[PDB]
Design a protein around this ligand. Sequence first.
Ligand SMILES: CCNC(=O)c1ccc(C)c([N+](=O)[O-])c1
Ligand SMILES: CCNC(=O)c1ccc(C)c([N+](=O)[O-])c1
Ligand SMILES: *[C@@H]1O[C@H](CO)[C@@H](O)[C@H](O)[C@H]1NC(C)=O
Ligand SMILES: *[C@@H]1O[C@H](CO)[C@@H](O)[C@H](O)[C@H]1NC(C)=O
Ligand SMILES: *[C@@H]1O[C@H](CO)[C@@H](O)[C@H](O)[C@H]1NC(C)=O
Lengths: 537, 535
Amino acid sequence: EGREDPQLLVRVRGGQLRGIRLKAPGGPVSAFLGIPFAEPPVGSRRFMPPEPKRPWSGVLDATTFQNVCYQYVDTLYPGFEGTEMWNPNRELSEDCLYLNVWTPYPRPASPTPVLIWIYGGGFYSGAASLDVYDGRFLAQVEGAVLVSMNYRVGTFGFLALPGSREAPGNVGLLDQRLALQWVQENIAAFGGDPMSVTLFGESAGAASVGMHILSLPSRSLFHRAVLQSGTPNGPWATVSAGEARRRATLLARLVGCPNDTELIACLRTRPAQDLVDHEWHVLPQESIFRFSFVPVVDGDFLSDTPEALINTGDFQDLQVLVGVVKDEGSYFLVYGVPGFSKDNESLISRAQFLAGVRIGVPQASDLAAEAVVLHYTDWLHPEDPTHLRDAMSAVVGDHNVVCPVAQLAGRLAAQGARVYAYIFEHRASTLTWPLWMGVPHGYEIEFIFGLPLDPSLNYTTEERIFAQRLMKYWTNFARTGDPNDPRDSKSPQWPPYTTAAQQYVSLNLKPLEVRRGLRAQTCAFWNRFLPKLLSAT
Amino acid sequence: EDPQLLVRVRGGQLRGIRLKAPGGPVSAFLGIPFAEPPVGSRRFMPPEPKRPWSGVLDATTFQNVCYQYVDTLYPGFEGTEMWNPNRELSEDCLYLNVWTPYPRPASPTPVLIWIYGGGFYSGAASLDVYDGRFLAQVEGAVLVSMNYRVGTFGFLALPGSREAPGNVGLLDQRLALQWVQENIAAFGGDPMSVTLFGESAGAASVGMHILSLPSRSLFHRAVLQSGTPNGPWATVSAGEARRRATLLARLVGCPGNDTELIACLRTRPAQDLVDHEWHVLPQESIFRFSFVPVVDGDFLSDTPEALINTGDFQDLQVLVGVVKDEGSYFLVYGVPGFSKDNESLISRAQFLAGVRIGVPQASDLAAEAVVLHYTDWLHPEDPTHLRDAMSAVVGDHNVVCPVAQLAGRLAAQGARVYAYIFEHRASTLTWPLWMGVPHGYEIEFIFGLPLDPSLNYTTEERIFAQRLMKYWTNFARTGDPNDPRDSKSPQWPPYTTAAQQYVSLNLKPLEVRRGLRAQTCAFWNRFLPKLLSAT
Ligand SMILES: CCNC(=O)c1ccc(C)c([N+](=O)[O-])c1
Ligand SMILES: CCNC(=O)c1ccc(C)c([N+](=O)[O-])c1
Ligand SMILES: *[C@@H]1O[C@H](CO)[C@@H](O)[C@H](O)[C@H]1NC(C)=O
Ligand SMILES: *[C@@H]1O[C@H](CO)[C@@H](O)[C@H](O)[C@H]1NC(C)=O
Ligand SMILES: *[C@@H]1O[C@H](CO)[C@@H](O)[C@H](O)[C@H]1NC(C)=O
C-alpha cells in the first residue's frame, strides 16, 4: 500500500477497497464507488436471480461509478437538460450490479444510521450514479452513511415467465435485496449501524421500498422507510402473472423467439439492445405512465397483490414517511398525450382532453372514462384550454401517484404504522421545464440530497436553507422514526398522518403548514368508486 | 250597493267583496266558477266551460277545495296544517279567485296567475299564504288563482281511453287561462300581459304549459319556483300511469275494457280512492307521487326532457329559482332518523338507507355513486354532515338539478332566463333549525304576508318582502325583475349557459353568483343517466 491515504482503505466480505476523498462545500467526504455485490448477471445468468459476488484478489479500485444497467435511453427532447439529467451517465452494460457508499471523512467514530437509496425510472431505466443522487452532501452535512445500488431494469430486471425456473420474475427487486443483505454484513466496516437502516426511493424506487415492506424476507433488512411519489399499490407498479407472461411471450416473438426453457434460451442469445429496442412495443394500449416490464405478482416475492397485502398485513413495527409533489402528472403528458409539449403552453381543447383521458387511464371502459371526464371538468368553464390542460395533468397525477399514496398512508396508518406525510410544493428556480408543468415529478430529489448547497449550481440562498431543512427532516426521521428535530420544538411540529385527522405538511420556502385531508374527495373517486365501476363493465 | 264590486263576465254577473290590506282596500272576487262541476260521470274527464247564470252571483267567499289527501304526519302542527285544506272538500271545486286594486284599475293592468303546489295530490288557492290582497294593493297588480283537480281525480289516466285520458288537472288549469283571456279585461286586467307563476307542482304545471302548444297563446311570461316539468317526479310514462290506475282499481275492488274499468271507478266515494292513493307507488319513496301528469302524446307530445331539449323559446321570458334547503322538508315523510322534533343526527348506515329512498329508482351501483359523492371524506361519519348531505341529495336530485338543467336548456335555445336562490329563513318559522330554509317558505314573502303587522314578522322581513314583490311584479310588467328606475348595481343579470349567473335573495343586497351547483348537477344530469342506462 505504502503511500495511499490510509482513511480510504476498507475491507468488505469480498475483499479490499480503495475509495476516494471527495470535496463537499463544507469539507471532505469519503466515497466508495463501484462496489460489486453480485456475480455479473450475464450470459446464462440473464433473467436469473443474483448470486452473491465471488471474493476478489488485491485492492479493488472504488473511486469511479461503475456501469449502468442496460436500459432504454430517452430521446424525446435530445440535448435538453430536463430529460438528459435522468439519462445514463456511465457505460450501458448487463454487468451492472454495483453499489456506492458515501460517509463522513474521516469515517465516523461510533456506529452511524444508514440511508439506502433506490432510484426510480419506471423499472425500465435509472442509475445510482446520477448527479441528483450525490450522497456527498448528506454525508458531510448530516454525517450520514449513504448507500445506493444499481438493480437490473426493463426486460433484464422484470421479464417473467411466472412459474418457470429460468425467468421467475422480479429479479431486479432481488438485486435490491442482495444489496440490503450486503449492507447488513459490510456497512459496519464504514462506520454504519446495520441496526438502523432506512430505505428511501422515488417513483419506481418508492414502489420498490413498498414491495420490500410487503415481502417477508426483506423486512428484516431495514427498520424505517420513505416513499417519495410512488407506491407498491396502484395501476403501474405491478402486473398479474398472466399479463407478465403475455408481455414476455410477445417480446420473444418481436425479437425472433417461438415450453418456457426453449423460449428463454433463445432470448438469452439476443443482444441486449435488441430487447431494449422492442421493450415499449408490448403494452396492451396506447398509454402514458405504463411500463412494460415491472414487478409481477408471482406468489413468492409478492405473495398476493400489494392492494390485498396492505389491506390485511400487520404494521405496528413500522415507521414510514410518504409524500408527493404538487404537480405529479405534468411530466408524463409530453410522452404521449397529443397537444402537450415543453415548448408551448400546452393549451388543449376539450376534444384533446377526452382523447387524453383515454390515454392517461388506458384500462378504463367507455363509462369509466366518462366518469373521469365528468369529475375533472370544470362546468363553469368546461372548454377553457387552461383549465383542461391543468385537469389533464391532475388526472394522470391523481390516478398514478397521489391517490395510491393516499390509499397507502390510509391503510398503513389504520393498521398500526406511524405515518408522516407531505406535499412538496416548491418549484426549483433552476428548473428547465416550462412554468405550466408546475412542480413536476422528481424535482424534490435535488433538495433532499442537498444539491443547492453546491455554490456553483446557482440555486438561491433561501433554497439553500430550504434544502438544509429537508435533509434535517429525512435524517431525523432516519435516526429516530420522526422528522421533527428533538431539541427544536419552537418551530412548527410535523404531526403523524392519522385516519381520524388525515394531517400532512406543506414542504415549501415558508415554514411547515399542517393541512387536513390529502385530496380527500377526488381520491374517494379513484379508490372507492372507480374500481366498483370497472368491476361492473 | 258598491259598483266597484259589480262585474259582468261572459257567464253573468258577479258581486265581489271589499277587503282591507294594511295600506288600503282591495277588491276581491272569490269563488268564480270557470267550469261545470266535474262530478258524477264527468269525473276523470276533461273540464267543460261553465254554463251562463241568472241574477248576481255571490263571489265573496272561497269555494270548496278539490278533493284530496289531508296530511296527518304532524296533527295540529302549523308547519304542515298550513298546507292542509282550509275549506270543505268537494269534487265540485273548479272555481277561481281574482284580486284587483280598489278602485278597479283605470288602465289595463298586468295579470299574475298563480298555480299552487301539493305534489299533484293536494293544494288549494284559498290557503293563507296565497292571499293575493298584498300584491294587488301595493303593486297595483291584478292577481288570479285557480283550483284544479288533484290526486286521482285530476291525473288518473288510462292512456288512449275516452273516459280517463289523463292530464285533466292540467286541462282544468288551461280552461282557467282561457277564462282569463276571455274575461279578465272586465276587472281592468290586461289579457295581453299575463304572467304565470307557481311553486313545486305548480312550477311544474307552468313548465308543462310552456311545453304544450295550446297553452302558449294564453300567457306571455312564466315563473317557476322550486319545481320543473322535467325531473324524476312531475311526469310518468303511459305505461306506468296505466299500471297505477289498474292497480288502484283492484285495491278499490273494481273490475278489462277501459270503459268497464273507469265506469266502476266512477261509482266510488271520493275517500275510497284517496284511501289507497299512496299504495300504488312502485318502490318505497319520498318526493314521489302516485298520480301526476302523464306523457300521453297529447298535452305532452313527448317527455319534458325531450321537449325542452328541442323546443324554440326565442320570445319566452322565464324566472326560475330554488330555496337553500329543498330536500329537508321531505325527509320527515319517510326517511328513518329524521324528525321535526330531534336534530336528526344520523349514522352512516341510516344515510346509505336513506339514499335508496331518496333515489328509489337507483341501482346498487348508482346509489353507491350518490353516497360516495355526498360523503365528506374529511368527516365521513360526522352525524351533522350526514344529515345535511341527506337533505342535499333529496333537494339536488328532485329540485335544484332539474332547475339547473331547465334553466340551461331554455337559455340555450332562445329564452330569457333569470335565476335565483332564496336563502332567508322566516323568523316566524315553526320547523326546527336543522331544516334551514325549507321547500315552500319563500311563498310567504313573494305574496307579501310580512306587511300584515299582526303576523309578527320583523321590520326587515317586511322590507325584504317588498323587494321580492317588486321583483316579481316588475318581471310581470316587463319580463325583467329589475327596477327601471333605480340606478344602483348590482343588477339581476340573465342566466346564460356561458356565465351561468344567478342571484341570492336574502336580507342582504343582491349578490351575483356563478354556477348553480354546477359540479354536483353535472353528476346528476350528465353522469347518473349514463349509469342507470348501464345497469
Ligand atoms: C418513443 C418511445 N418512448 C416511450 O414510449 C416512453 C418513454 C418514456 C416514458 C416515461 C413513457 N411513458 O410515460 O409512457 C413513454
Ligand atoms: C302516510 C302517508 N303520507 C305520504 O305518503 C306522503 C305525504 C307527503 C309527502 C310530501 C310524501 N313524500 O315525500 O313522498 C309522502
Ligand atoms: C404544442 O406543440 C405540439 C407539438 O409541437 C402540438 O401538437 C400542440 O398542438 C401544440 N399546442 C399549442 C397550444 O401550441
Ligand atoms: C451559473 O452562472 C454562471 C454565470 O455567472 C454561468 O457561467 C454558469 O454556467 C452557471 N451554471 C449553471 C449550472 O447554471
Ligand atoms: C327522532 O324522533 C322520532 C320520534 O319518535 C324517533 O322515532 C326517531 O327514532 C328519532 N331519531 C333519532 C335519530 O333520534
